[PDB]
Amino acid sequence: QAVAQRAGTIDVQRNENFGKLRAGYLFPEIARRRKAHQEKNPDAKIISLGIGDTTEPLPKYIADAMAKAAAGLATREGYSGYGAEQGQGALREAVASTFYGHAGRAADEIFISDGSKCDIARIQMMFGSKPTVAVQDPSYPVYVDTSVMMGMTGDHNGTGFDGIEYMVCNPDNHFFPDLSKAKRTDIIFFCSPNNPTGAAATRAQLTELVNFARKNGSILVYDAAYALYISNPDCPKTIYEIPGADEVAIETCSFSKYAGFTGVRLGWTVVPKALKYANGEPVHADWNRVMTTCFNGASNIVQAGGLACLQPEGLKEMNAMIKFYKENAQILKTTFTEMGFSVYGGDDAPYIWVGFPGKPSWDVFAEILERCNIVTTPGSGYGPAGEGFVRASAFGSRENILEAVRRFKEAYG
């Protein structure tokens, strides 16, 4: 019949929350802008210091663990077990003892997933639309964008979204917000080291943050994805090194490509049993319900790679890879500082954060791409307080980092 030759029919309205979003997500838009630039300039040899997708080859001890788990699928049955789609016990024990020995977290509070971004979306589903949110500003834009999608916010106001408390971190406050003036919210999202500024909060700063959350009765979602890169002994690698954090904080961590590991999609969350909603219900029970209902369990291939990373040879190879990326960050930082720019980060994180005052950061991004054929990311893509800066990733080969430096000195030196 004619019906099948015709459009249309559908009476469901678009979710109002998606209409609030202003632009597509930052990293896909940067990849699209890079592709458009290569279409305009087919001969350009583009170096990406943008999204961070050009991670170096994975440590062989980890790759080999994953390969052997994959090949082993041909000679075993499917696994069966109550303990658990929460993640293999051996991996959750290795994560608990490697990262949370001093910090007191148990294996049964660790939940292994396929990535931190996926877990942030699932946390937001767990919170639902009612809670109010505060976000460190600038920050990786998953926190704001998932808050908007879940309906936790008002409309965009031309600078940020109404209803989000942006906790501004900048050079003048040493990248830590003024909590004596910060508004109370239900949820606080905080990252250390922060992406994009590279700032790793000090022990005294995190003690302030935990005491702020506790006084306000807020849940703190703490992103420690880049904590492997912290060098300063005064900057904790987990929020659980702070007394009282177990009653307010959920931590998210990543061993994925985002954190520097080629080919990996793996993270975890920590939800302490001590963390309880206002009427006493444990957050851990609801998180477990989300993880068993909305998720299918991280693959046993990737969990084999995570467990290998935590064995002696895996830690040795991982540490060498972290040291290589940090040396790339220092090469980029020194290049910019010798040219007279103000540069932040690169000491505790594998990227740097460069001031370009007086021009919108999206225009700077376009100018660097035009003049140097280098992709960076614009600071305004990380929220209102990101305007005036650009981030450059250290995830790349040493030859590409060195060619980028040559190109930057030629254009800007």
Place this chain on the structure above:
Amino acid sequence: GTIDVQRNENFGKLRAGYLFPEIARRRKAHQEKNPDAKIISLGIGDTTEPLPKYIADAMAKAAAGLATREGYSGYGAEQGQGALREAVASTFYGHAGRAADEIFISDGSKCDIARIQMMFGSKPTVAVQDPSYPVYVDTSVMMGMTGDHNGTGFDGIEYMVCNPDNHFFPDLSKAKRTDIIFFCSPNNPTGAAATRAQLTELVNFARKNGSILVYDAAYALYISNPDCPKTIYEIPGADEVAIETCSFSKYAGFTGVRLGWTVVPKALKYANGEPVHADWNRVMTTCFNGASNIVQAGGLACLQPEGLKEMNAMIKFYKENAQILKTTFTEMGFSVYGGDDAPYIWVGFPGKPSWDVFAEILERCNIVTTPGSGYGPAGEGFVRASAFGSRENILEAVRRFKEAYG
């Protein structure tokens, strides 16, 4: 206490934990009471047979190769590798109109259903086939799309009841209109594969009502009957109303694999014209980090000629297991459904609660099954038995069932 955030009200609407973890817990408790019992699971379906080696090979080579390549960078795409999207579009939708840019590769269908529910939000009304795998009801409840539980099901859900007397297809002339309709074919747990005429009626009903149809084709690889479409897009006009979810994960029979896809046609538009594909792409790029390239290499190998030959042999094996189970029960006088187009059977145990039949089978036969009431209100009165297991264990389960019930 020191936290003032209230629990999400929608989590208080859930009455019990999720079905599959509870079956696993029951199995473990039974084993602890009976440490010498040799328990055969025909329950969750976790005991899938070893993965076809051509797939495992591709995954191992992709993993090993991580040690000698840089991270991938590319516009085409955080939706999944182009070669795999093209292979899915050609293999599964070559006569059904779908393009590679309508395919979104993920790490599994249950994660996609939760992300779909996020995209829809709390305002839409939901109809769910009943019985069905409980992710559709439970995610609807978590997202705030429903009222409270009422003793049988949740208020605010239109249950579309499929049973033996209606040939496992609801009476659409009497079904209330909703915004979203979740339907699966073959259905888990009944095994029913909707016919071409039935799916034409479903697509017509969705189009007349202006509803979005979310169609789960996870088990369509197991369909034998040529009258039963393997994708909703075989029905003219389905591109204007339907999203399809599919799985190549352990759920669909593939040991070790966490891989699925969704189809969101470019044609599918909300009431005021906005494309659903654009919001789904926003979700998949914001709320997800892209399926591993190890598992996508497995997916691509499964669709090459040797992969398909080995996958087809695996499907044929599980279907033989399902026929062995089905024959056993029918010879004992039970009414049995499924097994012909799905790798599980659905057996009538009228007059006793299915959770009591679950307990009885586990105590008398040391066999795990799943109770039909775990799949919604119209699942009561039945038990599902999975065909995902070794031939030795299937044969031993049949021996035990004959001793107990024959």
